[PDB]
Amino acid sequence: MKEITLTIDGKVCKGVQGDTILDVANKNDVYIPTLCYQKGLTPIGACRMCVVQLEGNPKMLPSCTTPAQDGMVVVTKNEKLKDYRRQILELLFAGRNHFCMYCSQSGDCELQRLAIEHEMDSVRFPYLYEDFEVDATDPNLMMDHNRCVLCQRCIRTCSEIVGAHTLDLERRGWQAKVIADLGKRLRESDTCVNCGACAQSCPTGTITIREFAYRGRRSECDAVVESVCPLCAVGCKIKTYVRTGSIVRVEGTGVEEPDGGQLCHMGRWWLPESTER
Amino acid sequence: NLIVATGHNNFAMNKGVEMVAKKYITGTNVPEGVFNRLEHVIRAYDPCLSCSTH
Amino acid sequence: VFKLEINPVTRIEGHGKITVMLDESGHVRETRFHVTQYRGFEVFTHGRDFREMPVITPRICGICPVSHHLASAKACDEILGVTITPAAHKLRELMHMGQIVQSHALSFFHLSSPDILWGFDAPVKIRNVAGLVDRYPELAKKGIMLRKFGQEIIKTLGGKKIHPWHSIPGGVNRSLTPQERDAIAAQLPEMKSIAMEAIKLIKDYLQEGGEELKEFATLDTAYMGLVRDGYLELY
Amino acid sequence: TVDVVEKVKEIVAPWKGKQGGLIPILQEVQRELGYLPEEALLTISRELKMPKAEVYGVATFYAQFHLKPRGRHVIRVCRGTACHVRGSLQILEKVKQMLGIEENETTDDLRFTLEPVACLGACGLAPVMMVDEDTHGRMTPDKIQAILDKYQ
Amino acid sequence: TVDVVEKVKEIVAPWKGKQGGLIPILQEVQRELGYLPEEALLTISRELKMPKAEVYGVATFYAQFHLKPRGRHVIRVCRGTACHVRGSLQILEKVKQMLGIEENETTDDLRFTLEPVACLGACGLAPVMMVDEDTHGRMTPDKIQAILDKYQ
Amino acid sequence: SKQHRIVLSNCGYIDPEKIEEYIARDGYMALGKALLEMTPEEVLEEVKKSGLRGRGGAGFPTGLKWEFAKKASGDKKYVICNADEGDPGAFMDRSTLEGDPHSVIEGMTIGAYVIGADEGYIYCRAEYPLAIKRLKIAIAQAEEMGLLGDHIMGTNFSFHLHLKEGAGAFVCGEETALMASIEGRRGMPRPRPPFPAQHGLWGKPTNINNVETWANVPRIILNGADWFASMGTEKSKGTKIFALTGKITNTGLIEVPMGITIREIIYELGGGILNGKEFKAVQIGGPSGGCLTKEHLDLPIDYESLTAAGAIMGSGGLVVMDEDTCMVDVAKFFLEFTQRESCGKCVPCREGTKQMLLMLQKICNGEGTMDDLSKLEELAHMVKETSLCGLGQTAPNPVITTIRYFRDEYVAHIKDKRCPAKICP
Ligand code: SF4
Ligand code: SF4
Ligand code: SF4
Ligand code: SF4
Ligand code: SF4
Ligand code: FES
Ligand code: FES
Ligand code: FES
Ligand code: FES
Ligand code: 3NI
């Protein structure tokens, strides 16, 4: 039977057979904390925050990658899962240098939303204060690597959605950094089409559009109007955020369409800049 | 480079503490009202020492 | 040979330390006034985008987070090379005036009003904002109202009271709708009354201690300020 | 500079149009050139039509690739379980403070290089401190000088 | 950096207050350090209270002083009258085009250095091409490879 | 001494560069037996009922693994030999590719016949500059005997046995990272599903099995089921090679039959301890495995009797540690090796292992507290329960186990300021 019936947090859920637990979760209503699942990009299993427990089975499995099997009891919120998710968030805060006081994305950060949700009034783990580089050579994008949870949603959105495969991982283990071509700066990169889809995929304020920093926040928007870019024929679908009579951020809907929300430079950088002429 | 408010008044505050000390000396017993006057010269400018030392 | 320390100097902002080095006879050889805190806002910022500076720089102080906000904003506006718009000028000036009002209200009523009222020899338990609320229930409330007026302007313009974000590099993020304009204007006959009563009180304090308070750390130095054509401009 | 553009463009010829083969395509430029310069990876990415970011990621992901010129004599100390329980860490830190160079980098003029390896096989004669030619079975704290001056 | 400040400040001690002695005071820092760094000349000028310009002028006026690090094996070819009439210029130019380095400078990684000298004495066995250890009596155009690979 | 060696029974005896001696040791007669008389399902049910508990560190009935590997929809299956060692002190796969370079070849030909695979790989580390040439010589000298080619033994079967030199990474020790390094890409464990036996190498089926588990396949059909059964206990079945090393008397491969009392594994087989001082611990699974100490003596070492003790019998890197070696020190060492050999995808193995390394370096120096120990225990349990592949799911075993067997010792490093091995206070 394609239509399978499960039980997430008591609430009964309905899904297609091949769907993962996160798909049948986001399909009905229920919320599972995720940081590395971008609707679209193939489920990458890096943050390990979406871990859910099956009844009887004492171990925990990611809801983004484990499939839904014909009837089963999934528990998403309890004490042990909350403890492990708080520990994961605290590891992320202790490893990288996260200062929310001055982050462009303090209100949109998905690591910040999760931290506040799990009442993270501490770090617990020793703060490793290592020096990760702040790549702001590009006049349009800035990559402040000490906020990088390492979710690869920027490598995947530049590998499978944009294609100009500019970003990949540098080293192994702890030294793993997101780099442009041959470990160079984003400005020095020949293969960046300056799209910004890396800024629409980054949940954690590492990659930010510079020109519209602190204004293109989704929490401080006055309105959210869906429309179509009028600059080219592709007519990308856009989700323009309006803050006091100006567009502050243009993120592209259509993560299910073949394009994948990768609006171009002219759409993520000329549309909000034209509301201020 | 930030040149902040209390910085320009640092010399005025130093010289003011000098002048209000040099008029309310006692060889011993070092009272508390003269301490309050030595603090009030600073509180006249009411300095944000956090700005001064960025 | 030996020295006195007033560490920590209280009812001021920050960390201070007055040392008074005396002689063998018990007379003041010399005094100095240290600030014993340093954070490094000239070495933090190397690498950061300049647009990050109007949000980093308000964290140098909470009594004047908009002063650093606006100075950083003018610095980044000269980095961009913008005009800037007259409406932005007047809104920035409104936020700066609100900050002037709130900082001077805190400076008079919270930090320096105990010495001005109860005298420099008053007991230490009464010399604070708390004993001021107790003994003078109306003056402390008036100072609180003036500080609240300033910070309501700052909050209306920039979201938060302390460390607001209202001035982008290039202009101003948010204007004033007529309702809150009228709300701010409807309290000005009362806040001006508060300010004038404080002016009269401090003028009676300075007129009472006639010549002593006229030589209380009064040294002749130079006076730097900002000026328009011939006027007093604060922005 | 022109010596590093055709040698890398010729070792890629028997891999054109074949799926896979970047791990071997590099193990060959490593054995030939001693290291993987940026020009090497650039030409590999050009010839295989593989992204430069992917090539650099694979080149820096695995330990036995060196993106900088490695020394003319490697000083592989064994930080395996058998040597470490025997106390090879002491030998490692003294060759560290003796060459004065960081943990996994080359000397300032390309004479030596310290490369902590896994078991070199002599888990009987522990600790082993291979000096790029032959095993060295005992290597107490004092026997490190009599070899580091000899091979230089 | 601190290794080059007291070794030069100690070899100058037996010359303080004595007229002359900058030619020897340098021939000693040359024999010890292999070359005369700018720090060396700076400390010589400080200690002897001789002008830095004079120290640099004497250091660059004479041939056997090298202000840059010389190689670990000198390749002194003889451009004397006896070798030149025999044709040593051919040997010199081929070691030139073979190491690819300029006339009187070191290799890029400090392995060799070409230093055209005067008569090394073997004006009978001409031309002589000393490779920092021993004489070499015949040195026809083909015998230059079999030694330059050996000493490296 | 006495060990009943059957896997590396020949090893050094047979000259590795000479195939004729190996076939003179009845070697490839299995291949013949399989390709001529034994129909594929028969060797399938043979190896299945043979109970060959997978020696790939995890433990598994590899007959069932091949049973999974066959039924995959496709026609381009593979068979891989993860000839790399997890423990960087283990030289078992090294010694087996040095001694008997043909057992693995014969076993993988058998298995590729069983599951219906044509292409196969052997991933051995490039940092073994002598095993590579022995294997390449073995591949050549088996190529010329019609053993890896078109219609091996005239049977309508194809098999090309490649040889991939490992780029030196323990991260590429699990299935999906091995399959990533073979496609020429960063070794990054993708989450299953897509499963390796269904959508593995190049999207085609894959049959990764251990080099020792492959080397046991020649002796499954030459002798029969009960032969492999008649070695020990009933739950786990077969025989394991062990890189017995450390500080006892004499290291080397000690292949003991089945669950045999740890006493007559270390006390008298190796023979005492160096300088005769009684041991205080033994690592029985390497870095992915736990520790056994002074209580697990009369215990069968079989796969079931020690997974509950907390130490998966992974690739036999047993190292003995007497009182002159600290347990916090070896815990930091193993966790440092793990931190150095990890991809960096999962937040638990990238940051957890870093912070656990920090907390262990702080407990060793004595700068630690009791909340430090509680945080170390909780982070260890979290990284075990949340990590992705299984390197990290078994990375804090040299902490967890050393907590459940040296707790007081841990306390003795923090509450009191003392350490058995006086290296640093
Ligand atoms: S990225 Fe998010 S969590 Fe990190 S500092 Fe910025 S707002 Fe805070
Ligand atoms: S701007 Fe576009 S092409 Fe460039 S890195 Fe970002 S997503 Fe990739
Ligand atoms: S830059 Fe952002 S999107 Fe990319 S890996 Fe880091 S946190 Fe994820
Ligand atoms: S976002 Fe760019 S590509 Fe898309 S319609 Fe607009 S201009 Fe065209
Ligand atoms: S646990 Fe995570 S980081 Fe560690 S090897 Fe597996 S995938 Fe990589
Ligand atoms: S959210 Fe499921 S693992 Fe990233
Ligand atoms: S233990 Fe160092 S050689 Fe294997
Ligand atoms: S002529 Fe060359 S040696 Fe004298
Ligand atoms: S572990 Fe640091 S000395 Fe015992
Ligand atoms: Ni201030």
Residue numbers in the entry:
A (entry chain A): 1 to 277
B (entry chain D): 397 to 450
C (entry chain D): 4 to 238
D (entry chain C), E (entry chain H): 5 to 156
F (entry chain B): 113 to 537
Any passages from the paper?
In summary, we have described the cryo-EM structure of NiFe-HydABCSL, an electron-bifurcating hydrogenase consisting of a conventional NiFe-hydrogenase module (SL subunits) and of a bifurcating module (ABC subunits) that is highly similar to a previously characterized bifurcating heterotrimeric FeFe-hydrogenase. We report cryo-EM structures of the related NiFe-HydABCSL hydrogenase that reversibly oxidizes H2 and couples endergonic reduction of ferredoxin with exergonic reduction of NAD. Here, we report cryo–electron microscopy (cryo-EM) structures of NiFe-HydABCSL determined in a flavin-free apo state, in an “electron bifurcation-ready” (BR) state, and in a “post-electron bifurcation” (PB) state. The structures of the NiFe-enzyme show that none of the previous proposals for the site of bifurcation in [FeFe]-HydABC hydrogenases are likely to be correct and that instead electron bifurcation occurs at a single NAD(H)-binding flavin in combination with a unique arrangement of three iron-sulfur clusters.
